[PDB]
Design a protein around this nucleic acid. Structure first.
Ligand SMILES: [Cl-]
Length: 127
RNA sequence: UACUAAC
């Protein structure tokens, strides 16, 4: 969008051992691309901790190597309404990560299942 | 709940 942009800060200090980035991206980044279609926004994960140590920097989009800010979703839209819907769907995911009772995060279960399909390691047993 | 890495 580029006309309207906002940063949604991820509560890393409060939850230092929750993997928010993985829950947002999903297998192959597919969850984040769905969130973008949901909100009609471009969404990027940026800031300190948004890049695995240490990725092929020369293969990264502009601005991705700026770690001055804490971890955030950068939301970009071409109306204020869309931008706010983008903040909403990111906040939804953050809330899901923190308030899901152990083992009841359906989004994450589905993600890990789909990941296993892609890696050919799917199992459907109780062990 | 197979631990995700998009642009
Ligand atoms: Cl079996």
């Amino acid at each position: 969008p580029t006309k309207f942009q906002d940063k949604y800060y991820i509560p890393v200090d409060q939850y230092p051992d929750v993997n928010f980035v993985g829950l947002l991206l999903g297998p192959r980044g597919r969850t984040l691309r769905k969130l973008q279609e949901d909100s009609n926004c471009k969404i990027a994960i940026r800031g300190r901790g948004s890049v695995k140590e240490g990725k092929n920097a020369s293969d990264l989009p502009p601005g991705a190597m700026n770690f001055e800010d804490p971890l955030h979703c950068l939301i970009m839209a071409d109306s204020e309404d869309k931008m706010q819907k983008g903040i909403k769907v990111c906040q939804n995911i953050m809330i899901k990560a923190v308030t899901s009772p152990e083992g009841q995060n359906d989004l994450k279960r589905g993600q890990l299942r789909e990941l296993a399909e892609l890696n050919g390691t799917l199992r459907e047993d109780n062990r």
